[PDB]
């Protein structure tokens, strides 16, 4: 009773998991040292 | 300037970047195939 209904919910997260990781890097570029 | 004022802001994100990644994996465990 769950083909990919879950795979869809995660795909959403995957978009959020990356958004954050991108915010950390950019901030690092501001202070690499 | 700032020293680590940025490093602190990111550390916060790092906690959020992981929170999401954890939600995706756990969900995967629910549907590995």
What residues does each domain of chain B span?
Answer: 1-27
Q: Cβ contacts of residue A2 below 8 Å, gap of 6+?
A: B30, B31
> Is residue A21 within 8 Å of B10, Cβ to Cβ?
no
Q: Pick from B6, B21, B31: which is nearest to A31 by CB?
A: B6
Q: Do B10 and A27 form a contact (C-beta atoms < 8 A)?
A: yes
CB A29 within 8 A of CB B22: no
Structure tokens at B33: 């195939």
- Cβ within 8 Å of A, B 4-23: 4, 6-7, 9-10, 13-14, 16-17, 20-21, 23
Backbone angles phi, psi at A4, to 5 degrees: -135, 15
Q: How many residues appear in chain A?
A: 33
Number of Cβ atoms within 10 Å of the Cβ of B13:
18
A24: Cβ contacts below 8 Å, ≥ 6 apart? B10, B13, B14, B17
Kindly tell me the sign of the dihedral angle through the C-alpha atoms of B14, B20, B22, B28. Answer: negative
Token pair for B4: 């680590």
Q: Would you state the structure tokens that stand for residue B12, as one six-digit string? A: 């916060």
């Amino acid at each position: 009773c769950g083909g990919d209904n879950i795979e869809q919910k995660i795909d959403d997260i995957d978009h959020e998991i990356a958004d954050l990781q991108a915010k950390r890097t950019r901030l690092v570029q501001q202070h690499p040292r």
